[model samples]
Target: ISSALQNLWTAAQAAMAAAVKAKAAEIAATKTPEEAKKVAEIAEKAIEIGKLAADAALGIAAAAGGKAVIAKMADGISPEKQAKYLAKFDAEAAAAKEGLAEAEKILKELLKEDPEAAKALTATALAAAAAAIAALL
Candidate 1:
C-alpha cells in the first residue's frame, strides 16, 4: 500500500508538469491583444479589397458576355450592351487589381508576425476568392 501511494504521487507530479508545459505553449501560441488588433485592422482592409475584387471579377465576366457568371450581373446586363459595360468592368478591374500586390505584401508581413491569427483568417479570404471564381461563367 505504501509503494502504491508513492507511485500515485509520482504520477500526479508528472501530470502537473505536463499540464504546465501545455499551458505555456498555449499562451505562446496566442497573440497579444495589441497584436490581434493590428491584425484586425489589416484584415479589414484586405476584406474590403477581397469583396471588391470578387465583384470586379463578376463584372468583367458579365461584360465579356460569357454566359452570365453572376446571376445579378447576368440578368442585369444584356449581350447587346456587353461592350457598353466593358469600360466600367475594365476600370473596376484595374482599380481592384492595382492594389492587390501591395495588399499581398502587407498580408505576408502580417502572417510572419502572427501565423495562427492569419491562418484562421485565411478561410474568409479564400471565401472571397471563391466568390470571385464562382462568377466566372
Candidate 2:
C-alpha cells in the first residue's frame, strides 16, 4: 500500500539551524525587518540562540554592543551552508519522525497492555505536555 512520510548534534543543530536559516533568509529576501525581529522578540520562538529582534535594532546599536551580537547570534553564515544544513535537516527530520511514529505506535499498544504504562500517566505529565504545546504556539 502506501508509506508514511516523516541524532543528537544533527538533531539539535537541525532544529536550531532551521530557524537560523529562516531568519537569515527572511532578513535578506524579507518577509520584513519586522519578521526578522521575531527571531528573538519572542524568546520561545527562537530556535536555540537564533535571535532576530536585534537585527531590527541594528541601526540603533550596530556601533556598540550590536557589532558582535548579530554575528554571534546568526553566525553570518553563507546561504550555501544554510541550504545544506536545511536539506539534511528535512531529510533526517522526516526519517526521524517516521521512526518516532513507529515507536509511539508500539508504545501505545504496549501501554494498552501494560498496567505500568497506565500508572506512568500522571497529571504533571499532562501539564508539562500542555505547556510544551503552548510554548510551540
Candidate 3:
C-alpha cells in the first residue's frame, strides 16, 4: 500500500510538470492575447487538478497510517494539535479543487469563443502532457 501511494504521488508530480511544459508550449504557439490567456487558464487548471490529487493522496496516506518521517515530526503533539494540521490540509485540498473548477469554467468560456481552435489546442496539450506523464510513470 505504501508503495502504491508513493507511485501515485510520483505520477501526480510528473503529470503536473508535464502540464507546465505543455502550457508553456501552448503559450508560445498562441497568436493572440486571448488565445494566450486561454492557454494560461487551461494550464492553471491542470496544475490545480494535479495539486488537489496530490493533497488527497497525502490525506489518504495519513489516514492509512503510513507514518513516515514527516508524521514523526509531530511527535509529542496532542490529538488536537494533529487535528489542527489535518484541518489545514483539508482546507488546502478544498481550495485546490475549487481552483480547478474555476479554471475549467474559464477554459469553457474561451472554448465557446472559438470552438474548433480551442478544442484542438486543448486536446493536444492535455494529451501530450498526460502521455508524457504516463510514460514516466
Per-model lDDT:
0.52, 0.37, 0.57
TM for candidate 2 is: 0.28
Model 3 steric clash pairs: none
39-102: candidate 1 lDDT, tens digit per residue: 5554554454354445455555555553333334765767557655555666755665555655
**Which candidate should be chosen as best, given TM-score against the real structure?**
3
User: Which structure is stronger by lDDT: 1 or 2?
Assistant: 1
In terms of lDDT, model 1 sits at 0.52
Tens digits of per-residue lDDT, candidate 2, 4-113, equal 21133233334444444444444435345665444223223223222222222222233334334434646577767656655655554455455445534544453454
**Alpha-carbon RMSD to native, per candidate:** 18.7, 22.5, 8.2
| TM-score versus the correct structure, for each prediction | 0.41, 0.28, 0.43
Highest lDDT: which candidate?
Answer: 3
CA error at residue 114 for candidate 3, angstroms: 1.4
Which of the two, 2 or 3, has more TM-score?
3
Off by more than 4 A, model 2:
1-77, 117-137
Error of 2 at 63 (Å): 32
